[PDB]
C-alpha cells in the first residue's frame, strides 16, 4: 500500500560526483512541473514522482487526444478533445503515465542518454495492486489474470477493450492481430483435415502405389552409393510410397489454391478489423512527424560535423548486409551437409549390419536444428550492432530498420534447409555411368528410396513440432525463471516489488515467431497439408503463454499509442505474395504430379495408367561402372544379377544411342514449366480479385463517422 | 460588346403551356439570388443572368476554397479560405461561373431534368472577347490562341498556369498529363532509333540471313496451298528475312526490358507531378461525398419503390456485358478472316499470273480497318445504352462506369487482329501429310514465306500510321466543320456568337485515344522497335490540334474542379502491368530468338552457328499427299522434283518412324517456356523495384506545406 503516483525512478546509491551533480540538476527542472518525493529502503534507493493537477490539462491540451463526453445518441457516448467530465479521478493510470512520460522526455539538461549513461538504472510506471494474492480490493490486474491470462480459459474470447485500457493500443493491437490470425486458422485446419483424410480413405485404390508394393517382379535398382551399398528391391520400401500417395494426392493441388486465396482473404479481414479498431479508439491519425528528439549519436556526430564546418557509407554497409545474407545462405546448406554427413560409411567398422537408415536422418535434422537455435542469437546480435553503426535519425527509424535486418537473417537461416531438400536434392547427380563428384573425392548426395518428398515431409514435420511447439515454448517459459534464480542467488513496498520484475524488451521478438510461422503456413502446403493444424495447436498455447508473461513476469510498458502494426503488414503481404511461385515449383518440380498426368495423357495406350513404374525406371547395364564404383560386396539377393534400374528418363542401353537424354525428359520438362506459368498467372489473378472485390474500408464505420461528424456539427452550433 | 455577366440560358420560343408554366416558375426561385435579364433577338430568344455581389461570398463561404492572401514569405503569396483582398474585380470569370453554376444546381422546383426535359436547350457560361479578330482590348483567349493553340508554336512549353485559370483544373490537368507523357517519349524515341540503327548496321554480318540469300542450294519448299500453289525456292523471298533480322535483333530484347522499366518510371514521374500540381492549386482533397443530387431515374425508380412499399439484375447485366465482350473477341477474328479471304483462289480466272501477293495483304488490312472504324461507334452506343439501363446513383458513378464499359470494347476490337497475327497464325496447321481443315471444306491459314513476323510488323506499322496519325486526326478536324456546314445550310451579340459553337462532350473520347496509343507503345515493342517514334509524331500534332479545338471550335466548359485524372490511372497501371507477360510471349513464341540460342548452345558442333536453316527445314516426300492436295500444276522450276522441305521440327521420312514429333520440338518448347518464367519474374521484380525506390511524395512539397502550416500558425496567433 502507498499513495497514488505515476512514474518511478531507480538511481544507484553509493564518476560518482558527476552522477550526483546531474542527479540533483535534472529533478530541479522536474520541480516546476511534477511533485517528486524520494524514498530510502533496504537494497538500493529509489525516487518517486506524483503528478500535480493543473499541469495535467496543460499537457492533455498540449496534444490533441479524444476523451469521453456526456452526450450519447444511439446508446454510445461521443468523444471530443478535452471537456465536460469533471471527476478528478477519471484520468486512467495508463493515460496519466503517458502524460508524465511526455514530461519525462520533453525537458532536457530527456532520459534517453540520461538513462543510457549510467546515472539512472530504470525508469518505469508501476501497476495497481497485485494478481491473485490475498484480500485485494478488486484489482484490475487480478481481473485480467482471472479472465485472460489463465491456461484454463482458452476458449473464451479476448477481452480486448480492457487490455487496451490497461496496456495501451500497441500491446492491445498485437493481441487483436493474433486473435484474428488464430480465428482465421479454423477453416484452414478443417479443410486441411478433410483433404488429408480424403488422402487416407483412397490409399489402396490407386495404381502407382500397387506397382511398388507388388511382389513377383524381381526388379532391382542400382546401389546409390560410391563403394559400399548393395542392390535393393523395389517392394522393400513400400511404406514410403504409401505415405507419398498420402501426401501428393490430387486434392492437395486444390488445397494449395485454397491456401493462396486464404492468405489473401486474411489480409482483407485484418485491414477491415484494424479499421474498426481505429474507429473505437483514435481516429485522427495525423501524429506530427519529427516530434521527439533525435538519436543521441546523430546529435553527437552532428556536433562533430559542426566542428568540421555521407551518401557513400550507408550503401556500403547495405552491401555489407547483402554479403552477410549470401554467406548465411551458403552457411545453412554447409551445416546441413555436415549434418547428413555426421555418420557416413559406418557399414564396415561396427560390422553389426543394422541398415536401419533412421538415426542418420533423425539425428541429422536434430543436430541441424541445434546449430540453427545456437546461431540465431548471433545473427540477432549482428543485426543490432550493424543497425547501431548505420546511425539512424529517430527511434522509429531504429525500430523499423532493425526489424528488417533481423527478419532477413531469420528468414534465411530458418528456411534454407527446406529449400535444399525440396528443390536441390537429387537433381544434380548424373547417370550410373559417371557421377558428379563434389570436392573431387566422393559423390554429391542421393535421394531417398521412393522419392525425396518423404524427407521434406518429416523434416518439415519435426520443425513444426520440434522447434515451434516444444522447444520455443519451453525456453520461453524457462528463461525468465532462471534469470529469477540468478537474481536471487546473488509488508514489501510497491516499487520494491516491481524492481524484482524483468524489464520489457519490445514487440519484435514476439511478432517474429508469428511471421516465421505464417511462412510455414503459406510457403510449403503444396506438398504437406495439415500444417495449419500444427499452427493452431501452437497458437492456442502461444496466446495464453504471452498473456501470462505480460501480467505475471514483466513490469509495465509505457503505453506508446500507434494505429497499425507497421512494417509487419508489408512483411506479411510480401511473404504471402512470394508463396504463389514457391507453391508452383513445389507442385511441379517436386510433387511428382506432372509425370503421372503426362503418362495418363500421352503414353496410356488405354484409358488409365498401368506400368507407370515400368515406364519411369531407366534400365542400366552393370558392366559399365567406372572401375571401383561397383557395389563392393554384391548382396546375392537372388541367383545372380545382370541389369539394375534407375529413374532418370533415359533410353535403354541396347539402342544405337546409349545413356543419353531421351525424348520423354524434354516432354515432361515442357509440361512442368507450362504448369508453372498457368499456376502462377491464374493464382496471382485470383489473389488480386479477392482484393478488388472486398471493400477495404468497412461501410458501418464510414457511415457512423459521417453521422458522428454531422451530429458533432449540429451539437456544436447551438 | 455587352456588360459583365456569368451564365446564359437558351429557351425555345414559340406541351408549350407547361413549358412556359415551368419557364416562369424556376426563375422566380432565381429572383431571390441572381439578377436575370432576358433578351430578344433574331433567331431564337435567350435568357441572361448577372450575379449580385452580397450572395457571392455567401456561396464562396458556403464551400471551402483557397483564394490569394496579402502576405508573402519567400517570394510567394500564401492562400487561405476567404479574406483580405477587397477589390470587387478579383473574382475571375471561371470562379464566378463556378459559383453561379452551384446555384444553378442547388435550387429545385436543378437544370438536370429541367435541361434534359426539353424546355431549356442549352445552359453555358460565355467567354471574354474573341480570338484573333480586330481591335480587341487584350483578350485572354487571344493571348491563349497566340501562345498555345497555334501549330507554329509546338516547341515552346505548355502555359499550364494560364490554361488552368481560363478552363479549370480538369481541362488543365489533362494537358499537364499529355505534356508529361510526350516529354517522357523523348528518350524512348532516341533509344528506339539507336536500337533500330544498330539493327541496320550489322544486317550483312550475320549467318542465318545469308543461308537464305545464298544461291546454289536448290532447296525447295512445299506449296502451302490446298490445290493451286506451286513449289517455291528459298532464295526467292530473301528481303523479308533481311527485314526479319532488322526486327528480331538481340538488342530488341534489351529494348523490351527498357520499355517495361520506362513505363514504370513514367508512372512515378506522373504521380510526383500531379502531387506538386495539387500543391499549386488546391491541397485539401476532402470534398464532401454525396454532395450533389441523385440521378433522376434513380429518384424516379425510387419513387416507384415507395409506391411499391435489386441485387440480381446488375450482375445479370454484367454477365450480358461479358457476353458482348466474348462475341466481340470472336467478331474481330471473323472480320480478319473475311479480310484475308477477300480474294482467294484468283490464280486461275484472270489468267494473267501476276503472283504479286501484295493487294491481298494490303487491302485485307485496309478493309479490316474500315470495318473497325465503322463498328467502334456501335460499341460506344451499346456502352451508353447499357450504362443507362444499369441506373447508377450519381453523375460520378455514371462517368466512371461508362468509362470502363467503353474501354473494354475499344480494347477488344482495337487489339484482336494483332493478337491473331502475333500468336495464332501458323501454329495449328499439321504436317504436309494431313491438314487441319476448318469448316471441313478447305485449309485454315498459312504463314508468310520467311516468318509471320513481317505481317505483324507491317500490320502494326500501318495501324501506327493509318488509323492513329492520318485517319483519326483527319476526321477530328473534319467533323466539326461539316457540322458547321449542316448548321448553316438549314455587330453580332455575344451569346449569339457562342450559340453557333458546338457543345462540349466530356474528356473521355480524348483520353481514350491516348490510352489505346499507350497500349501500342508498351504491348508490342518486343517485336517492333521505333513505335514510340510514331507515338511522338502523333503526339506533337495531337496536343496543338486539341488545344485549337478548345479555343476555336467549342463553347466553354463549366470548370469542374478535381484533383486527379481518376479511373485512367488504374487503366494505365493495368495495361502497363499486362505488358510484361505479353512481351514475354512475343519474344519467346514469335520472335524466333529461342531456336537460334538453342542451336547455338546444343547443336553447334563448333563455336558458332552454320547450317541453322539446314537444321530447321523438315524434309518431306512428295509421294505422300492426300489424293488431290498435290500442287495442281507443278512449276518445273528445275529438271524434276523429289522432296519438298518445311519448317516444323519433325524427323526425316527414311527413319523407322516417319512424320512424327521429334526430340528437338520438345527441347525448343522447354526452352521457350523457361524464358517466359525467367522474363516475367525478373521484369515484375524490376518494375516493382523502381516503385519502391522513387519517393512517391516529393520532398520539396512536403517540407513546403509543413513550413506553410507553421507560418500559418504563427501568423494566425497574433
Ligand atoms: Ca512461441
Ligand atoms: Ca511467444
Ligand atoms: Ca487523334
Ligand atoms: Ca484528340
Curated annotation (Swiss-Prot), chains A, B:
Outcome following mutation: residue 538 to A: Strongly increased threshold for activation by calcium
Effect of residue 467 to A: Decreased permeability to chloride ions
Native source organism of the sequence: Mus musculus
Reported impact of residue 447 to A: No effect of cysteine-modifying agent MTSET on ion permeability in contrast to wild-type where MTSET blocks current
Site (Unlikely to bind calcium but may play an important structural role) location in chain: 271
Control of this protein's activity: ATP and calmodulin are essential for its activation. Channel activity is inhibited by CFTR protein and by chloride inhibitors such as niflumic acid (NFA) and 4,4'-diisothiocyanatostilbene-2,2'-disulfonic acid (DIDS). Activated by heat with activation seen at temperatures above 44 degrees Celsius. Activated by BDNF in radial glial cells.
Outcome of gene disruption: Mice display severe tracheomalacia with gaps in the tracheal cartilage rings along the entire length of the trachea. 90% of mutants die within the first nine days of postnatal life and no mutants survive longer than 30 days postpartum. Embryonic radial glial cells exhibit significantly shorter processes and mutant embryos display abnormal cortical organization and decreased cortical thickness. Conditional knockout in mature vomeronasal sensory neurons abolishes calcium-activated chloride currents but does not affect Tmem16b expression or glomerular development in the accessory olfactory bulb.
Subcellular location: Apical cell membrane; Presynapse
Effect caused by changing residue 368 to D: Decreased threshold for activation by calcium
Record-given protein name: Anoctamin-1
GO cellular component: apical plasma membrane; cell projection; chloride channel complex; external side of plasma membrane; glutamatergic synapse; plasma membrane; presynaptic membrane
Effect of residue 268 to A/K: Increased Ca(2+) sensitivity
Annotated function: Calcium-activated chloride channel (CaCC). Plays a role in transepithelial anion transport and smooth muscle contraction. Required for the normal functioning of the interstitial cells of Cajal (ICCs) which generate electrical pacemaker activity in gastrointestinal smooth muscles. Acts as a major contributor to basal and stimulated chloride conductance in airway epithelial cells and plays an important role in tracheal cartilage development. Required for CFTR activation by enhancing endoplasmic reticulum Ca(2+) store release and is also required for CFTR membrane expression.
Transmembrane segments: 177-197, 250-270, 316-336, 365-385, 404-424, 454-474, 508-528, 529-549, 567-587, 675-695
Record topological domains on the Cytoplasmic side: 271-315, 386-403, 475-507, 550-566
Assigned keywords, A-Z: Calcium, Cell membrane, Cell projection, Chloride, Chloride channel, Developmental protein, Disulfide bond, Glycoprotein, Ion channel, Ion transport, Membrane, Metal-binding, Phosphoprotein, Synapse, Transmembrane, Transmembrane helix, Transport
Bridged cysteine pairs (disulfide): 213-238, 222-644, 225-229, 447-452
Reaction catalysis annotation: chloride(in) = chloride(out)
Amino acid at each position: 500500500m502507498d499513495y497514488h503516483e505515476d512514474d518511478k525512478r531507480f538511481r544507484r546509491e553509493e564518476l560518482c560526483r558527476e552522477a550526483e551533480f546531474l542527479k540533483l540538476k535534472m529533478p530541479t527542472k522536474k520541480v516546476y512541473h511534477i511533485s517528486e518525493t524520494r524514498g530510502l529502503l533496504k537494497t538500493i534507493n529509489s525516487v518517486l514522482q506524483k503528478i500535480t493537477d493543473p499541469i495535467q490539462p496543460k499537457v492533455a491540451e498540449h496534444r490533441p487526444q479524444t476523451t469521453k463526453r456526456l452526450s450519447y445518441p444511439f446508446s454510445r457516448e461521443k468523444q471530443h478533445l478535452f471537456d465536460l467530465t469533471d471527476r478528478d479521478s477519471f484520468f486512467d493510470s495508463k493515460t496519466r503515465s503517458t502524460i508524465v512520460y511526455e514530461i519525462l522526455k520533453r525537458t532536457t539538461c530527456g532520459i534517453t542518454s540520461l538513462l543510457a549513461n549510467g546515472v539512472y538504472s530504470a525508469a518505469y510506471p508501476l501497476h495497481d495492486g497485485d494478481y491473485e494474492g490475498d484480500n485485494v480490493e478488486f484489482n484490475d490486474r487480478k481481473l485480467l489474470y482471472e479472465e485472460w491470462a489463465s491456461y484454463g480459459v482458452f476458449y473464451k474470447y479476448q477481452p480486448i477493450d480492457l487490455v487496451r485500457k490497461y496496456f495501451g493500443e500497441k500491446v492491445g493491437l498485437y493481441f487483436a492481430w493474433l486473435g484474428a490470425y488464430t480465428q482465421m486458422l479454423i477453416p484452414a485446419s478443417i479443410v486441411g483435415v478433410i483433404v488429408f483424410l480424403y488422402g487416407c480413405a483412397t490409399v489402396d485404390e490407386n495404381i502407382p502405389s500397387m506397382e511398388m508394393c507388388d511382389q513377383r517382379y524381381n526388379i532391382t535398382m542400382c546401389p546409390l552409393c560410391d563403394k559400399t551399398c548393395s542392390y535393393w528391391k523395389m517392394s522393400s520400401a513400400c511404406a514410403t510410397a504409401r505415405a507419398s500417395h498420402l501426401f501428393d494426392n490430387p486434392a492437395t493441388v486444390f488445397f494449395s489454391v485454397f491456401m493462396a486465396l486464404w492468405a489473401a482473404t486474411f489480409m482483407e479481414h485484418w485491414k477491415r478489423k484494424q479499421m474498426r479498431l481505429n474507429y473505437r479508439w483514435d481516429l485522427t491519425g495525423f501524429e506530427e512527424e519529427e516530434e521527439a528528439v533525435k538519436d543521441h549519436p546523430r546529435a553527437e556526430y552532428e556536433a562533430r560535423v559542426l566542428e568540421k564546418s555521407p551518401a557513400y557509407f550507408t550503401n556500403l554497409v547495405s552491401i555489407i548486409f547483402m554479403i552477410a545474407v549470401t554467406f548465411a545462405i551458403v552457411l545453412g546448406v554447409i551445416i546441413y551437409r555436415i549434418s547428413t554427413a555426421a555418420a557416413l560409411a559406418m557399414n564396415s567398422s561396427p560390422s553389426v549390419r543394422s541398415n536401419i537408415r533412421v538415426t542418420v536422418t533423425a539425428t541429422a535434422v536434430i543436430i541441424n536444428l541445434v546449430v540453427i537455435i545456437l546461431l540465431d542469437e548471433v545473427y540477432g546480435c549482428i543485426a543490432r550492432w550493424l543497425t547501431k553503426i548505420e546511425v539512424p535519425k529517430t527511434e522509429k527509424s531504429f525500430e523499423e530498420r532493425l526489424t528488417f535486418k533481423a527478419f532477413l537473417l531469420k528468414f534465411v537461416n530458418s528456411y534454407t534447409p527446406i529449400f535444399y531438400v525440396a528443390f536441390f536434392k537429387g537433381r544434380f547427380v548424373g547417370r550410373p555411368g559417371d557421377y558428379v563428384y563434389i570436392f573431387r573425392s566422393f559423390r554429391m548426395e542421393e535421394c531417398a528410396p521412393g522419392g525425396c518428398l518423404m524427407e521434406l515431409c518429416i523434416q518439415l514435420s519435426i520443425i513444426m513440432l520440434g522447434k515451434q511447439l516444444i522447444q520455443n515454448n519451453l525456453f520461453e517459459i524457462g528463461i525468465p525463471k532462471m534469470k529469477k534464480f540468478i537474481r536471487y542467488l546473488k509488508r514489501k513496498q510497491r516499487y520494491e516489488v516491481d524492481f524484482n520484475l524483468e524489464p520489457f524488451a519490445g514487440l519484435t521478438p514476439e511478432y517474429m515467431e508469428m511471421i516465421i510461422q505464417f511462412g510455414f503456413v503459406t510457403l510449403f502446403v503444396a506438398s504437406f497439408p495439415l500444417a495449419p493444424l500444427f499452427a493452431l495447436l501452437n497458437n492456442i498455447i502461444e496466446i495464453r503463454l504471452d498473456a501470462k508473461k505480460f501480467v505475471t513476469e514483466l513490469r509495465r510498458p509505457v503505453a506508446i499509442r500507434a494505429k497499425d502494426i507497421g512494417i509487419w503488414y508489408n512483411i506479411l503481404r510480401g511473404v504471402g505474395k512470394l508463396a504463389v511461385i514457391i507453391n508452383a515449383f513445389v507442385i511441379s518440380f517436386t510433387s511428382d504430379f506432372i509425370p503421372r498426368l503426362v503418362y495418363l495423357y500421352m503414353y496410356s495406350q488405354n484409358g488409365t495408367m498401368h506400368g507407370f513404374v515400368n515406364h519411369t525406371l531407366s534400365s542400366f547395364n552393370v558392366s559399365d561402372f567406372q572401375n571401383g564404383t561397383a557395389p563392393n560386396d554384391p548382396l546375392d539377393l537372388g541367383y545372380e544379377v545382370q541389369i539394375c534400374r534407375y529413374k532418370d528418363y533415359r533410353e535403354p542401353p541396347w539402342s544405337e544411342h546409349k545413356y543419353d537424354i531421351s525424348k520423354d525428359f524434354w516432354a515432361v520438362l515442357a509440361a512442368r514449366l507450362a504448369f508453372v506459368i498457368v499456376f502462377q498467372n491464374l493464382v496471382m489473378f485470383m489473389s488480386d480479385f479477392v482484393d478488388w472485390v472486398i471493400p477495404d474500408i468497412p461501410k458501418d464505420i464510414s457511415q457512423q463517422i459521417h453521422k458522428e461528424k454531422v451530429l458533432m456539427v449540429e451539437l456544436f452550433m447551438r
